[PDB]
Amino acid sequence: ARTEKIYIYGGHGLVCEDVAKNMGYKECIFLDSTLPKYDFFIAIGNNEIRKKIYQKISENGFKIVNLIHKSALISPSAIVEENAGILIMPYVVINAKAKIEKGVILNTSSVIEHECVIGEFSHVSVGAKCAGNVKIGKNCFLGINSCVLPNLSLADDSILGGGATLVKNQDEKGVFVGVPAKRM
Template sequence: MAKKVVIIGASGHGKVVADIVIQSGDQVVGFLDDNPNLGKDFIGFPVLGKIDQFHNYEEYWFVVAIGNALIREKIVTQLYGIRWYTAIHPAATVSDIGVFIGEGTVIMANAVINAGSFIGKHCIINTGAVVEHDNRIEDFVHVSVGVKLAGTVHIGKRTWIGIGASVSNNLSICFDCMIGAGAVIVNNIEEPGTYVGVPAKRKNVNEDTIFS
């Protein structure tokens, strides 16, 4: 039976998540969003109200379509007693051997999740990203478009890996890191912060210029 899904976040990311829901044979009920400038509908689906009205739709499934990990985590902790929808695009490749994907996670088209990998709750594995064998990705991580994670990589909670970045095998990146677009990680990262370049080094920079 098709699942009926409420999407939190009426934005560009929300559009992609809606498409995954539809492509998976499920139904988009509508969106919840706190943006006061939204109209009554978004991409042809109703805007059901603000996020704190979630309790009016508890019979449905929910997914958070917001890229920012801190905001995503805050919303998840506020929404209690609901069912989380895990959105996996039919065009994603997910191994049948020892893969775990946590609730509320979104895996987009052409992403690859190879054998033995663990993906935590409410993560984003974006379009065309490669998660090689035996990776461990903690909750609320965002792996951006075209990222390549080699084998046995560990990504800490709430870390964002920017577009096209690469992480060499057998490395760990700690929690609350921002990895810049195109960065190449060749050493363990043990301190939260922003890392850019080839090879990546810690920088004090305006994150908006790196990850937007």
């Protein structure tokens, strides 16, 4: 049972506020002890800080909810960890049997195809797409309009640049870049 107010810890904060209000929260209290135990969310885009704050807030008896825009479409057979500080932005689609772990950010219009696993505290940017059966490690970043082809795995702590297309399995962490626009 979600509370009527929500604390938002953390730009990215106002965006999370919009998602909270979309869900039906009546009031958002920004933060950046003895307070009432309203639902909490951590609006920090940075994976490492988000995890640290997650641990601290959880240890002080707060429920860290998921913020999921009403327009996000989630398959009934998908698994989204409950009360796990996951952000799911508008027009995200999560297909059959995909699994989203705690603290993940799925930003606007990202797509998680069937049977994917998105590792804890990963950040999937606007328009990024994961094809079927893709495994994204913990603490990964997939840049804007990036994509990962079917059946591929990306190791923990990796970065996929904006516009970049991952085409091979990567069992060691790394940084994988796309081609930048060139001035003519």
